[PDB]
C-alpha cells in the first residue's frame, strides 16, 4: 500500500499482534448421593382361619 497506509497498517499490526494472555481454568464438579429404602412387612397364614 501507499507509504501513508503502510504506517497505518504498521500500527494496526502492532496492536493486533499483542501477546495474547493465557488463562488457567479449573472447574470443580462435586456431587453427593445416597438414600434409604426400607421394606418391612408381616404376613400371617392360618389353615383354619385364613391368610394375608
Amino acid at each position: 500500500a501507499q507509504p501513508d497506509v503502510m504506517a497505518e497498517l504498521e500500527q494496526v499490526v502492532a496492536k493486533l499482534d499483542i501477546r495474547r494472555a493465557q488463562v488457567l481454568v479449573e472447574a470443580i464438579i462435586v456431587e453427593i448421593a445416597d438414600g434409604d429404602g426400607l421394606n418391612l412387612g408381616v404376613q400371617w397364614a392360618n389353615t383354619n382361619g385364613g391368610g394375608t
Binding site: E8, L16, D17, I18, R20
Partner: peptide, 27 residues
Amino acid sequence: KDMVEVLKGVSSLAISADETTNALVIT
C-alpha cells in the same frame, strides 16, 4: 466477531475482527 456484525449496521466504513486477540480493526 459478534461486535463486527453489530457495527456493520452502523457502517452500512470497513471492519474486521481478529478471532485471536479478540480485537476490532475499523477504518
